[PDB]
């Protein structure tokens with residue numbers, strides 16, 4: 001059996017909040033905006049959102065304190081500040097961190113007796129405020145997925161499945177402010193979503209169609225996007241959205257799980273972390289799906305590994321034996337394993353990290 005479900009109404013273009021944003025008036029009269037500390041003030045996005053809320057006569061509060069890789073505590077800081085209000089909907093503005101934060105808060109503001117940990121029990125998540133997502137990186141695709149990735153108190157990034165956003169608004173102009181480094185990392189996150197979705201045991205025909213297009217766009221446009229080419233950035237933002245729609249159908253694979261400690265413990269941005277390990281996870285997946293792995297390598301010019309190396313993705317990462325064994329143990333228990341072709345023993349995982357990180 002396969003299923004397709006992706007109910008978000010997605011709007012893409014320059015000045016999209018002006019041109020299509022008034023539809024949010026269907027959601028109510030009061031909104032909570034969640035965003036990061038600075039970037040949305042410098043790319044016009046927060047100003048455009050304030051213009052839209054004023055136009056639609058929707059009152060609002062702004063929580064501009066979402067941290068990268070938001071923790072359970074960061075979510076608690078907001079939910080405590082805002083459960084005594086009466087919001088009709090939540091708007092996430094920024095990258096995956098505030099977009100994921102918006103999904104968690106939209107559940108917790110409605111379900112007032114739930115804890116953050118309860119978000120990980122599907123049975124407990126019955127109701128929620130509607131969510132609108134306005135992405136500014138290219139990207140996580142969070143605007144078209146039901147997932148929220150939070151860092152638990154023990155320091156482990158952990159994903160939960162909540163709701164799809166009702167509306168997603170993509171204005172490529174917002175991504176023009178990304179640094180070259182952020183463009184690389186977010187672009188490789190999009191790449192990883194497309195590749196992992198295509199290679200996943202949960203692959204479907206519609207998600208494969210979207211993934212193949214996203215891969216082709218990314219191969220063609222990521223180098224130029226990193227250098228600041230605006231047309232290429234617009235195309236990357238499209239591809240990140242397609243790749244989100246893919247993983248909304250498939251979920252991700254072990255590559256995503258293995259990147260998590262690199263982000264939390266070694267300071268490596270999520271997309272770069274996943275990308276570094278991805279080619280080495282694919283070498284194991286070839287035991288089961290060599291033809292699909294060959295297709296991915298072909299799309300990326302012959303070798304996804306070489307494509308990534310050429311973009312300067314790899315960097316020296318210091319790793320102790322204690323760290324490596326901890327990550328191997330965690331990786332061996334990843335829920336993602338069931339979705340990943342191939343057989344992943346602790347040794348294969350150990351080797352993936354050693355090869356990816358130069359240790």
Ligand SMILES: NC(=O)c1ccc[n+]([C@@H]2O[C@H](COP(=O)([O-])OP(=O)(O)OC[C@H]3O[C@@H](n4cnc5c(N)ncnc54)[C@H](OP(=O)(O)O)[C@@H]3O)[C@@H](O)[C@H]2O)c1
Nearest residue numbers: 036037038039069095096097136137142145147149177178
């Ligand atoms: N939900 C999902 O399906 C899913 C999938 C993959 C990954 N993720 C998660 O998403 C998070 C990563 O999201 P992300 O890679 O988009 O980055 P992010 O963590 O949201 O932000 C990274 C940095 O980029 C800045 N920034 C954002 N937009 C910018 C812009 N247009 N121009 C200049 N700087 C900008 C932010 O600044 P400010 O803080 O000042 O705004 C921040 O310092 C991780 O927690 C990851 O696990 C979620």
Ligand SMILES: [Fe+3]
Nearest residue numbers: 140189256270
């Ligand atoms: Fe990701």
